[PDB]
Paper text:
Phosphatidylinositol 3-kinase type 2α (PI3KC2α) is an essential member of the structurally unresolved class II PI3K family with crucial functions in lipid signaling, endocytosis, angiogenesis, viral replication, platelet formation and a role in mitosis. The class II PI3K isoforms PI3KC2α, PI3KC2β and PI3KC2γ are unique in directly synthesizing PI 3,4-bisphosphate (PI(3,4)P2) from PI 4-phosphate (PI(4)P) at the plasma membrane and within the endolysosomal system, in addition to synthesis of PI 3-phosphate (PI(3)P). Like other members of the PI3K family, PI3KC2α contains a PI3K core that consists of a Ras-binding domain (RBD) and an N-terminal C2 domain, as well as helical and kinase domains (KDs). In addition, PI3KC2α harbors the C-terminal Phox-homology (PX) and C2 domains that are unique to class II enzymes.
To determine the X-ray crystal structure of PI3KC2α, we embarked on an iterative process of construct screening and optimization of various forms of PI3KC2α from different species assisted by hydrogen/deuterium exchange–mass spectrometry (HDX–MS) to identify disordered regions. A purified mouse PI3KC2α construct containing a re-engineered internal loop sequence and lacking the intrinsically disordered N-terminal region and the C-terminal C2 domain (C-C2) was used to obtain the 3.3 Å crystal structure of PI3KC2αΔN+ΔC−C2. The overall structure of PI3KC2αΔN+ΔC−C2 comprises a large compact multidomain kinase core that is mounted onto a helical stalk. A conserved feature of all mammalian class II PI3Ks is a sequence insertion of about 100 amino acids between the RBD and the N-C2 domain that is absent in class I and class III enzymes. This sequence folds into a unique stalk-forming HBD comprising four helices. The compact core region is flanked by the distantly located PX domain that is stabilized by contacts with a neighboring molecule in the crystal. The release of the PX-C2 domain from the catalytic core may thus indicate that the obtained PI3KC2αΔN+ΔC−C2 crystal structure represents an active conformation of the enzyme, a hypothesis tested and corroborated below. Consistently, we observed the PX domain to be displaced from the kinase core, and closed contact I involving the N terminus of kα12 to be disrupted in the crystal structure of PI3KC2αΔN+ΔC−C2. Instead, in this open conformation of PI3KC2α, the kα12 helix interacts via hydrogen bonding of H1391 with the backbone of a short helical segment within the intermediate section of the activation loop. Torin-2 binds to PI3KC2α in a mode similar to mTOR.
Author numbering: 4 to 43, 49 to 85, 93 to 157, 166 to 229, 255 to 281, 293 to 320, 322 to 383, 405 to 432, ...
The structure:
């Protein structure tokens, strides 16, 4: 453990060299203003400049870079020294990026607020975060209780040398050993047990004495126990070793008195590679409790696994579950690729330490990768024309096993499409050592693929160190700005690294050192990720490495933010206590502790670190009247240019779900305006600051549909009086609502009522609550409304209670958005998949991802999808239309009347078959069902099945594909009556069956025939 941690710490010290504090690029000391490249105007900008009372105000064209805008400003009053920052926000604009790229400018242009920038030199910029010379210079880090017990042991041995009273002295020796074991988590190695029993016997049995030699064996056995407990400090290759994988589970040490009270204990042993087990788990023998010094659970059972060491892949790990008291996991190869050998002491937690003895040969077995093939590589049509359809496939989910085997065979012909490599690697048949030569030699010549698509290669299914490393190598093509918004997926992807010092963690630390915003985001994500029981330890280690590398300035700022979070936590929790008028008083009394630490502590806002705070505005700060009792905190800005900071802070409810929902919506808007569709969406942030509590970005001049109801078109009219301004404010409503519609369906957020739908003064619509964000199955399976579009919301669409051209436009926008998200189904699925391990409710199963995919209809053509979504909108506006759309949506995502196939070897052969009688049925249609009498071989009692003439027709047509028409009997083809035709068809079908079961043995024993006569729900009663 600590040897792996030392290696990790060394590699961190190496990583710090490429980021010296002297380089301003890697260590600016300030946040950069996040930018999103938008496809396809001028606006007014006020730029503060040094020496002038009033800022310079002028119209600045958006296309122009920031550099030329600085040069434009310099005219009214060193080139590299001047930079532009946002007024009241400690975030600097990008130098070589256009103005309308930055989130702050685009937010300002959608909101319609004055752009306030400040031109200043790098010297004048606050850099309290900048990593100093001491930080860069310092080492990376993340008292001894047994020394005295060893001293006492050696002293008791020195006294034992006196032959006056040997027995006496030896007793105090043995007692010393007891205390040592008790201190070492209670671990008594069998070497010590045998050494103490040998000592007792060598003392009782009177150039060496028997007491001296047996005591020298004690010392040896204790120091060997220490070597194992600390786990600190002739080479055969792994693919040579033909030995079976085996180890000897010894005992669990330092057991509590409460355990002896559970009758018997046993372990379940599993071996896994890319997440899924390799073989059925192996149980251990059930044993009670053994006693020598302490109470233990002695097993001493060899466990052998049906594979050789050669077969073992590098990333293979051994799981031992205790009986579900605790689960331990051990990597069969260490971080240095040496195969686990000798005794191993594993740590388990309950409401403790497991000794596992691995074979310790004289020679150390190490694992090594195969050499590179270096082949470095003929086109054939039709098969190509078809293969292109399989590379066109959305993802690896929409692939049949036959498609996978066909794709893997035409492997080297897909070198012209890098983004399908996850489809190839998920279509790889085997993961054997000999086949790795081919795959690795392919990957090393494989052209780098889109970093968004490289997320897929970071899931558990692609847990090969070389694949992961290449994935991380290709990931270094994204902007930090694009990364930050994907960062949580990467934090959860750290779970699928068995070794601490992964490529992934190195990349994340590299990016965190290059950008404070990334480090800031990583901090809160790793903080909430510590709540994991298993990966807790790992996440502490990567967070500790981030803090130690981030410098004293950054870490001290984050420590400030942490205490601010904890104080506001305690305040918000005190409001849940009181439901009287007293509640409003408890805010001010609880504020004593909060405003006190603000004295000589300019803390940054955890939700938006660019904002700095001095103190609170008691008059402004109020509660929120719901069930969670959230608090809006109005903090005065430290920069007098900046406006007051309104932020919500919630306790009791889990925000992890909200965060994921909002990240999805943000990425939807991103990919929308990445193609040139700007549905002017409302993007509000949210930060899980701990355990079911965190900060929420507040939206000014916005209320829910309940508060507007108690007072819709009149609300917007109040804020936009002019009918000119009103129609322009309604245009915003159409675009925002459309974006909300496509987001609500595709995500499967169904629980849409007046309280979770919200509108702002400008007319932009946004959803706030995401309790059941991924509840797709509830919407599909049962009759939960996919989207709610109120008649009032239809009134807000230009034209009141009238068919309008603007509604057809709205539909066109909805359809265009739907298609644009359908093109990126894989990205959405990969993001959700990586966020499964978080333990978020409604995202636990792969089926949840499949449901999203089925709701996205990626196979369907854009035009057919637009028809589907238009008829969804038509529904949203009677119950009859809603139920019809429900039936067509269910039928779309989905022998006919018997899905499951059955053979005569399961149900039992048939002796006699006749059509007993015919029954008339009106439901669903006015048809005739026929009661077929079946007598099985050896069965006394006759069964019955009920089959309609259409269910017979299907069978005759199904059998005509395999068997010829001359071998099968003729099927019956107006006159008489409907009852007389049914009465004659009875006898004609009875003649057809008799002729079918006596034609030949191949026909009468076909699997379709058995299936046709198989019991179903229509047959049973
Ligand atoms: N899960 C959630 C719930 C609510 C919000 C949310 C976000 C921004 C707001 N911006 C402005 C306003 C203005 C008046 C206002 O009342 N709210 C608001 C709406 C619903 C619930 C609450 C709550 F009780 F939970 F605090 C507050 C809000 C806002 C509520 C975010 N996430």
């Amino acid at each position: 453990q600590n040897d792996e941690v030392a290696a990790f710490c060394q590699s961190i010290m190496k990583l710090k060299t490429k980021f010296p504090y002297t380089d301003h690029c890697t260590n600016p000391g300030y946040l950069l203003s996040p930018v999103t490249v938008q496809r396809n105007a001028s606006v007014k900008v006020s730029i503060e400049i040094e020496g002038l009372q009033l800022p310079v105000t002028f119209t600045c064209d958006v296309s122009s870079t920031v550099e030329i805008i600085i040069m434009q400003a310099l005219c009214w009053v060193d080139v590299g020294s001047y930079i532009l920052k946002v007024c009241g926000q400690e975030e600097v604009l990008q130098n070589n990026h256009c103005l309308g790229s930055h989130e702050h400018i685009q937010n300002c242009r959608k909101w319609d607020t004055e752009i306030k920038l400040q031109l200043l030199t790098l010297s004048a910029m606050c850099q309290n975060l900048a990593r100093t010379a001491e930080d860069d210079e310092a080492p990376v880090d993340l008292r001894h209780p047994v020394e005295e017990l060893l001293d006492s042991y050696h002293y008791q041995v020195e006294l034992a040398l006196q032959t006056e009273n040997q027995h006496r002295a030896v007793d105090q020796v043995i007692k010393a050993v007891r205390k040592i074991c008790s201190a070492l988590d209670g671990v008594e190695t069998p070497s010590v047990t045998e050494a103490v029993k040998k000592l007792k016997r060598a003392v009782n049995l009177p150039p060496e004495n028997p007491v001296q030699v047996s005591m020298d064996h004690l010392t040896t056995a204790i120091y060997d126990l220490l070597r194992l407990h600390a786990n600190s400090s002739n080479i055969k290759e792994a693919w040579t070793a033909t030995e079976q994988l085996q180890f000897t589970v010894y005992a669990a040490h330092g057991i509590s008195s409460n355990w002896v009270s559970y009758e018997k204990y046993y372990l379940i042993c599993s071996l896994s590679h890319n997440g899924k087990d390799l073989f059925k788990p192996i149980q251990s023998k059930k044993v009670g409790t053994y006693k020598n010094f302490f109470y233990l659970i002695k097993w001493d059972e060899l466990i052998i696994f049906p594979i050789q060491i050669s077969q073992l892949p590098l990333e293979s790990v051994l799981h031992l579950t205790l009986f579900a008291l605790g689960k331990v996991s051990l990597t069969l190869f260490d971080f240095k690729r040496f195969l686990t050998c000798g005794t191993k002491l594993l740590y388990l937690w309950t409401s403790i330490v497991l000794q596992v003895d691995f074979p310790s040969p004289a020679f150390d077995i190490i694992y090594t990768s195969p050499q590179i093939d270096r082949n470095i590589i003929t086109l054939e049509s039709d098969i190509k024309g078809k293969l292109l359809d399989i590379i066109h496939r959305d993802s690896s989910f929409g692939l049949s096993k036959e498609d996978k085997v066909f794709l893997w065979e035409n492997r080297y012909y897909c070198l012209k499409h890098p983004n399908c490599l996850p489809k190839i690697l998920a279509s790889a048949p085997n993961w054997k050592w000999a086949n790795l030569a081919k795959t690795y030699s392919l990957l090393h010549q494989w052209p780098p693929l889109c970093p968004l698509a490289a997320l897929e290669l970071l899931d558990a299914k692609f847990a090969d160190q070389e694949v992961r490393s290449l994935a991380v190598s290709w990931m270094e093509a994204i902007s930090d700005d694009e990364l930050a918004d994907l960062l949580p997926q990467f934090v959860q992807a750290l779970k699928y690294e068995i070794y601490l010092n992964s490529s992934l963690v190195r990349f994340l630390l590299s990016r965190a050192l290059g950008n404070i915003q990334i480090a800031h985001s990583l901090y809160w994500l790793l903080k909430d990720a510590l709540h994991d029981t298993h990966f807790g330890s790992r996440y502490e280690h990567v967070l500790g490495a981030l803090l130690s590398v981030g410098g004293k300035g950054l870490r001290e700022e984050l420590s400030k933010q942490m205490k601010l979070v904890q104080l506001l936590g305690g305040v918000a929790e005190k409001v849940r206590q009181a439901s009287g008028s007293t509640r409003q008083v408890v805010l001010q009394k609880s504020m004593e502790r909060v405003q006190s630490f603000f004295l000589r502590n300019k803390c940054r806002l955890p939700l938006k670190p660019s904002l700095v705070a001095k103190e609170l505005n008691i008059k402004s700060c109020s509660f929120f009247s719901s069930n969670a009792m959230p608090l809006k905190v109005t903090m005065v800005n430290a920069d007098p240019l900046g406006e007051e900071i309104n932020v919500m802070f919630k306790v009791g409810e889990d925000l992890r779900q909200d965060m994921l929902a909002l990240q999805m919506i943000k990425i939807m808007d991103k990919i929308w305006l990445k193609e040139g569709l700007d549905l002017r969406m409302v993007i509000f942030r949210c930060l899980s600051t701990g355990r079911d509590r965190g900060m929420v970005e507040l939206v000014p001049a916005s209320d829910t549909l309940r508060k507007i109801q108690v007072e819709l078109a009149e609300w917007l009219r109040k804020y936009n009086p002019s009918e000119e301004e009103y129609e322009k404010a309604s245009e915003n409503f159409i675009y925002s609502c459309a974006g909300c519609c496509v987001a609500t369906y595709v995500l499967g957020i169904c629980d849409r009522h007046n309280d979770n739908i919200m509108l702002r003064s400008t007319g932009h619509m946004f959803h706030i609550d995401f309790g059941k964000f991924l509840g797709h199955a509830q919407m599909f399976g049962s009759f939960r409304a996919p989207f709610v579009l109120t008649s009032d919301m239809a009134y807000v669409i230009n034209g009141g209670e009238k068919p309008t051209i603007r509604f057809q436009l709205f539909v066109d926008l909805c359809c265009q958005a739907y298609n644009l998200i359908r093109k990126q189904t894989n990205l959405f699925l990969n993001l959700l998949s990586l966020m499964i391990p978080s333990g978020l409710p409604e995202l636990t199963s792969i089926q949840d991802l499949k449901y999203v995919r089925d709701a996205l209809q990626p196979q369907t053509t854009d035009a057919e999808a637009t028809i589907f979504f238009t008829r969804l909108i038509e529904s949203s506006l009677a119950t009859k239309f809603n139920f019809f759309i429900h039936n067509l949506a269910q039928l779309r995502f989905s022998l006919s009347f018997s899905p499951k196939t059955y053979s005569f070897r399961q149900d039992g052969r048939i002796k006699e078959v006749s059509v007993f009688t015919y029954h008339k049925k009106y439901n669903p249609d006015k048809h005739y069902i026929y009661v077929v009498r079946i007598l099985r071989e050896g069965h006394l009692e006759p069964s019955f099945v009920f089959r309609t003439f259409d269910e017979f027709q299907e069978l005759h047509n199904k059998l005509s594909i395999i068997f010829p028409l001359w071998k099968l009997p003729g099927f019956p083809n107006g006159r008489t009556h409907i009852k007389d035709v049914a009465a004659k068809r009875k006898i004609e079908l009875n003649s057809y069956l008799q002729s079918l079961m006596n034609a030949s043995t191949d026909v009468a024993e076909c699997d379709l025939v058995c299936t046709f006569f198989h019991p179903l729900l229509r047959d049973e009663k």
